[PDB]
Amino acid sequence: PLSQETFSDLWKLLPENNVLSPLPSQAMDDLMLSPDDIEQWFTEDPGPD
Amino acid sequence: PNRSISPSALQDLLRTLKSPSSPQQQQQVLNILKSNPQLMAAFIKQRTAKYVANQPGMQ
């Protein structure tokens, strides 16, 4: 019903095995996400409208 | 990486995403993500390195 191009496979590509940033998940002290980025990872779905 | 996750949270994110614009939608996304630290911590760590808090000269 979906593909390896959708959000469910994009989770696997994240840096869950590395350390990039100089600080942990507590970084949200002055930043919070928007729905425009949430509607990006599901758009790859090979279905109609 | 300290514990497991469930695919049900991904479906709950999709049902939440389709709702109209409201502060309750933001709270539900945070509620859903906090249940599965594994993927949300990797996501924020990847995002903070590319985060953009403003917009260009438009009208």
Side-chain angles (χ1 to χ4, degrees):
Chain A
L2 55 65
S3 63
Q4 57 279 101
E5 303 183 275
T6 66
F7 79 128
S8 307
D9 214 83
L10 298 183
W11 302 126
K12 307 174 185 171
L13 300 180
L14 297 175
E16 65 170 80
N17 65 353
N18 216 278
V19 188
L20 308 183
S21 315
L23 82 177
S25 311
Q26 195 167 85
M28 298 193 132
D29 186 68
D30 195 49
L31 58 107
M32 194 98 296
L33 279 300
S34 297
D36 186 72
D37 191 38
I38 309 179
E39 74 176 89
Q40 149 279 142
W41 49 28
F42 95 120
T43 208
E44 298 292 90
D45 178 61
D49 177 37
Chain B
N2 290 351
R3 66 172 174 84
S4 303
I5 63 170
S6 299
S8 51
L10 288 55
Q11 310 312 305
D12 209 334
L13 187 161
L14 291 178
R15 84 183 169 173
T16 297
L17 174 61
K18 290 188 293 183
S19 296
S21 304
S22 72
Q24 287 66 46
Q25 187 174 51
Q26 184 179 274
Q27 187 64 61
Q28 270 295 102
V29 174
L30 293 168
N31 294 346
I32 292 162
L33 291 176
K34 281 300 310 182
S35 189
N36 37 83
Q38 284 59 240
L39 53 71
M40 65 146 288
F43 169 66
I44 198 297
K45 185 175 64 186
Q46 183 59 90
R47 275 286 175 273
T48 196
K50 304 294 175 180
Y51 220 102
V52 177
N54 224 256
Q55 283 178 115
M58 62 74 179
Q59 190 180 90

